[PDB]
Design a protein around this ligand. Structure first.
Ligand SMILES: [Mg+2]
Ligand SMILES: [Mg+2]
Ligand SMILES: [Mg+2]
Ligand SMILES: [Mg+2]
Lengths: 175, 174, 174, 173
């Protein structure tokens, strides 16, 4: 019943910012006996992000943790705004608005836990996921059907493209 | 039955946890270089931080021993790390005496048979959906979320709520 | 539509496959030492071996590039390993020309948009439950089992059955 | 139910496939050439319990890895036969050298290479995600899946059949 409300918020998005753990991954933090840390991403999310970028949308990562894995994933996907070691997601997002000349109302943010709440609440289009905390889900404009690390990002990428009448055009390039 | 669960959680000063099956989904991972791997859940970290910040002491009691457990514990401020110990009750009782906290003010979460007595005898005993039937049977509470998937975060929030500390935790992010 | 599916599968001489989301569940795994990991499914290995032994040529066509794919392919006797190639149809047509096999006698299994044209134009196009809707729409068959969980094994058995080789394959183990 | 218990009651040797039984069947490779395999904690306790009750534990697998050696060592799995082409002839060979009749052997497997061993063992076991043909010749199919408690489940079944289960539980009470 909220589809066109969601569409109106997504239609004006010029910047798409994302949390990592629980969004681009299923939230697993993986350590081994040699001190090495591991993180897993989802292939379909990659193509979804490529689609947004192709449509002219600026991509950003804002995470409280810091790893080479995030740097590597961001670089291969052409995400050039990689903010790590930053729990205060909203201040980081506002920082980007000033850096890039994009209004906050034209920014999307997807997050899963409490550090993401304010950014999800205050962004033009705030998104969460089924396994997100209840409080961040409560302030979201949209909650994905697919879970983090299992297509949540791909799903909201398609949603934004649809709201901007760019989805069918993108699909047609593969047909 | 949440009223009696909140009543038990109200008095908790020490929260002790098994590792495999609780903080992880129970996978023991090895590779051809001789390296062992373990996986944890990001939301459990924030939950344990909230518990610690509220004044509750955190402990790990595990039958295995690994560097991953030391790293994760250090990262989350788990100050009492007991590894290579299958006898969970003796370990928990040892902690009660050392810290000066009654067993009735201890919470313990476990998943398999070695955890049974500690879950049964602790002031607040918790298990998980994929815990063994016998350990689930003696639990005061079984989580909705599974081990390595938010069971720990869930218990953390329950204890915070019971102690009127949950909304203060949430408020910092609003 | 199974009579039509069997018709298409009956004449397959080349079986070509996407990797991520087909042979794996789609996870791209990195670690802090710059190492990449990929996971495959054991039962898929036997299925592909069976297809190969029945006289079908095996091929991989993937947009990514890794040593893990080379290793898995060599292990299973996948003889055409095309990596760093998102244009699946051009690669597949290239194979038809090199091997002297009509496109109508090629099978292709894929999960996402880059695979769409190949799935559509191949003699037998296959996708998977978690494949994108657009690639599923142009498929001749969609597996019950998921990518990295037996989707490949399933279609291998389907092709063996369509070519009257399945029961004979089973018989070798009895 | 009772026919299963009759077959399980006299088991002296419990032999197992690895991939799809002790694991969920994932074969994991990395860019440094390193292979990974995952096991389940609850299976560990189940196997240890079986071993302590006097049952000899064995692994018979077509693949070969250090991970299997490591997991076997920590659980007291004392016969580790890797890289085996024919699992039935490996089981027959092992049970002959140990002086145990095949009728007193259990074997759990998931795929076609396990079929003959599951069929011919005194107690043959498979798993839900096992192939239909191996499931067809099994005396018992577990409810839990490989790498997710299938082994723990059958261990408890055998303990029950040998009047050792309630005592096993009681040691933890
Ligand atoms: Mg997160
Ligand atoms: Mg445990
Ligand atoms: Mg793919
Ligand atoms: Mg197997």
């Amino acid at each position: 019943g909220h589809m066109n409300e969601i569409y109106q918020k997504a239609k004006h998005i010029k910047l798409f910012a994302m949390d990592v753990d629980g969004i681009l991954s299923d939230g697993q933090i993986i350590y081994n006996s040699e001190g090495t840390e591991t993180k897993a991403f989802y292939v379909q999310d990659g193509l979804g992000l490529q689609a947004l970028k192709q449509s002219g949308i600026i991509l950003a990562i804002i995470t409280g943790r810091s790893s080479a894995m995030v740097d590597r994933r961001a670089k291969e996907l052409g995400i050039s705004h990689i903010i790590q070691g930053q729990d205060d997601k909203l201040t980081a997002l506002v920082g980007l608005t000033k850096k890039l000349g994009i209004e906050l109302s034209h920014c999307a943010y997807i997050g899963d836990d409490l550090p993401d709440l304010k950014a999800v609440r205050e962004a033009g289009f705030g998104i969460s996921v089924p396994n997100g905390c209840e409080q961040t889900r409560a302030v979201s404009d949209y909650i994905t059907t697919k879970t983090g690390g299992n297509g949540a990002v791909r799903e909201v990428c398609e949603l934004i493209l649809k709201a901007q009448n760019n989805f069918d055009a993108f699909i047609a390039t593969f047909q």
